[PDB]
Amino acid sequence: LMQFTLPVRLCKEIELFHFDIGPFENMWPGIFVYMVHRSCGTSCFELEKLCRFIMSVKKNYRRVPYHNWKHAVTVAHCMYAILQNNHTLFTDLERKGLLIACLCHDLDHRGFSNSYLQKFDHPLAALYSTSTMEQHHFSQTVSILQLEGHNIFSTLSSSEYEQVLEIIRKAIIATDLALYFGNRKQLEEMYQTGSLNLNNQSHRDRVIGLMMTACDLCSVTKLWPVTKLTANDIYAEFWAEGDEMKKLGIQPIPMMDRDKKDEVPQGQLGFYNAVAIPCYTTLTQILPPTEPLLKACRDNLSQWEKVIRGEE
Ligand SMILES: Cc1cc(C2CC2)nc2nc(CCc3nc(-c4ccccc4)cn3C)nn12
Ligand SMILES: [Mg+2]
Ligand SMILES: [Zn+2]
Known part of the structure; x- marks a missing residue:
């Protein structure tokens, strides 16, 4: 009979696609489990094993800027949002x-x-x-x-x-x-x-x-503001790789070269047009209730456009 319940703001915001899981690491395991219980059932997984499994997964993600434990729970939330709307x-x-x-x-x-x-x-x-x-x-x-x-x-x-x-x-x-x-x-x-x-x-x-x-x-x-601060996490990994590429004696692509920070807005634009927008477009066509993802992706496209024109 042992359910997880979340504070009211989270209980309500977690069901939305744009939910951010926040800066309190220790809550992410409960958040995940809450998601499994609502999406799959209380029965799906013996709780003793699920918890112990969740904590070994956490232990095996490293402390990198972007491909971290926080990225893992974020992606699982987006999946939860898709499965609950379909x-x-x-x-x-x-x-x-x-x-x-x-x-x-x-x-x-x-x-x-x-x-x-x-x-x-x-x-x-x-x-x-x-x-x-x-x-x-x-x-x-x-x-x-x-x-x-x-x-x-x-x-x-x-x-x-x-x-x-x-x-x-x-x-x-x-x-x-x-x-x-x-x-x-x-x-x-x-x-x-x-x-x-x-x-x-x-x-x-x-x-x-x-x-x-x-x-x-x-x-x-x-x-x-979540998209903007995550793009700093992604670029810190990429600039660390470009440094390493340089150490092998190879010019990295501009994406991975930190001496080309300034062309980032233009870079994220390219990315939205060539990858994100098509992804969310085709996904909406196949699963109509996933539209918010496309709407939100378009809003951020427009926010990068605005950075490029030095309106921010
Ligand atoms: C794989 C991936 C995942 C995500 C996740 C957050 C949603 N965001 C991402 N942003 C980029 C990077 C885009 C990107 N910058 C450039 C660029 C940057 C500076 C100078 C010159 C060129 C080129 N290009 C394609 N990759 N990428
Ligand atoms: Mg990967
Ligand atoms: Zn990933």
Whole structure:
């Protein structure tokens, strides 16, 4: 009979897409659990295992500016918001899997891109030739599942356990933004030729793909002061990578060069047009109730336009 309840402001704001989880680390575990209980059920996961699993995941995120424990809970909230606004479209198994897939999706991120692992010649690039970090994140997810007392899916049948771990795997892989562009193009066509069908599992995998890129990017769907201060977190990682690239004797792309701070507004603009806006556009078309994400993304587009004209 043991539910989590949140202060009134949070209980009410958490159901909105633009919810920010705030600066009190110690609340994020309760917030996550609250989300699982409302989205999935009180029964979905034995609470002793869920808590112990949540705390091992936290322990395995590093202290990097952006790809941190706070990013993990943020992405899981965006997924919660999608699943609560589309509650008949998804299986019991997808609801379980995706919230766990989102929390785990950047486990053990070092704050370096797949490109920097390859050019450094890091061991993980030898183990995994594409989607290097993403396959590492899935690997660490299995690791923490197999720690004693941590199997939150112990109740699942052999088949169900295999189906969910597959959902999680494809979910995490999809957060590889290099795979997104093609995934959205195919989902664009299928919808517009009327061929998109959610009883086709290969089609459901694509939709979940896009969902995962939507949640992963949801910093651009927040209030402007949250979007603005998150863009500082992202650029600090990128400028640290460019420094490292320089140390290998390679000019980094301008995105990653700190001597090119000033072209950031123009950079975030490019990003909204080429990635975020298409992502949230195609997602709205497929799942109409996700519109707020597109509305909020457009508002922040317009706020970067305004920075460029030195109106702020
Ligand atoms: C992968 C990713 C995730 C998110 C998450 C927060 C939502 N935001 C993001 N912003 C950027 C970075 C965009 C970006 N800056 C530039 C740039 C910057 C300065 C000088 C020159 C060029 C190019 N380009 C594409 N990547 N990115
Ligand atoms: Mg990632
Ligand atoms: Zn991420």
